[PDB]
Symmetry: D2
Subunit: 149 residues, 4 copies
């Protein structure tokens, strides 16, 4: 009924160890992709993670509901079809801004790579007809991360 | 490629006139709900709108992907089942913060009401088996607004 | 050093009573402006409030660090100098989007007014030479609110 | 005035080359810190950059108006005084969430390092008494970047 007093949000520190990477859900990827969830902002709805991708691996088709920013630290990544199809081809080290609405039918890694990314909102994985089969946000990502970890 | 130079985003002013309220899609509501899209932030993925709701009207079942804030200027609104079912019943004038993940089965207006609201991210409308039949973000809302208007 | 588990953020409901409006700080306004702080998002850094402005009142000079959106429910408001000086003159009911960087030397109310507003980030109040004398965000706003009521 | 139509925000790709690192302003750091601005969101108020910091270098005293997230790819970094003073001592590779209100009196790099970071809102640099002497956001950061091209 009344204004809710708030306290300063706690700062966080997460050491990234090779030992903590786990298999990324097979339902949403191809190839032995592994990852780590690094942070969730339940109030903002943003989340951050890091990924290791083998040569020839990819992610299932999805649309970004909000802006996402990536930092490719190792390898090469083809987004939105790669440069050969009007999209972008990233070489490490590099950065990218993938806006709200960005369609990623098959983000592909031709070489063993690694990339860090922050997402605002969910990733809507779609079927061959463009219908949403699953809306994956911080909560769904955290559920999967802890279910495997 | 290279860093993209940016300029100051333009400020906006929108007069709210009775003449511009249009019928809200029948697929996602019941009763003669009318509305007006006021602003869309394509970079942030946030959007803002105002609604006029007849007595007995409601919205179809949906989940808030991100935080949303409402200012009920007139009437009464039963959110998350209303006070009688553990949720809240807003009485004008009042404010509300509905967080990311909030499930709104049938937001109901017992009396003729009006409310202003800002949304971060999309509203995922679901069927009786939990499946997301439509992810409505700034882009989808603008499309429905301009198509009807 | 490890990932921090998060839980769904709590929803909020705030009844706005005429009895809870208190005097806005005299150092940052002129005339007899009264207000109420409605919500703070310590994680996002956004905050929301509502103001009652007497005829002839105004706010001290400031720059918006981030985007702010207002809903003028009563009266008239001159922002950025008003229409007569390249800015905007708002008439109730109306909406407005004031972007990051917006300079508000003396937001003025020629007539008794009222407006609701959401802010992302702080408002940097500046002196006549443009030097920042106070950066007011959700924390500073909550501090002033709890100290007066 | 009426609703302003919007279109999908353009995706971006930026190659991080050593050709682009330039000296960071000496008025806000000590040591030979170099950097690259990667992205500015004028609508959202967020911005992103990457820094190369020599052993013994540091940043001038500041407070984060909003949340910031970093990825330390090389070296070591002491934040909020280091674990020695109730803060954190980050070792590459590691991640950190520095919330709104975070006080960074003298972020220090004992060894040659590198870190990528996203900021929401400005960094308020303060004098010895705690007075804001400079509010640096995307616009101020872009100005410094373009100037020292
Ligand atoms: Zn994607
Ligand atoms: Zn809802
Ligand atoms: Zn202002
Ligand atoms: Zn800092």
């Amino acid at each position: 009924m009344d204004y809710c007093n708030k306290k300063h949000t706690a700062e966080e520190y997460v050491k990234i160890s090779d030992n903590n990477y786990v298999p990324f859900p097979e339902a949403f990827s191809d190839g032995g992709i592994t990852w780590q969830l690094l942070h969730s902002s339940p109030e903002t709805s943003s989340w951050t993670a890091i990924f290791n991708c083998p040569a020839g691996s990819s992610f299932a088709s999805h649309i970004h509901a909000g802006p996402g920013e990536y930092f490719l630290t190792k390898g090469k990544m083809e987004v939105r079809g790669g440069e050969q199809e009007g999209g972008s081809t990233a070489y490490a080290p590099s950065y990218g801004f993938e806006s709200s609405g960005a369609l990623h039918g098959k983000t592909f890694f031709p070489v063993e790579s690694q990339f860090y990314m922050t997402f605002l909102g969910p990733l809507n994985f779609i079927d061959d007809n463009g219908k949403v089969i699953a809306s994956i946000g911080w909560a769904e990502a955290q559920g999967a991360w802890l279910a495997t970890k």
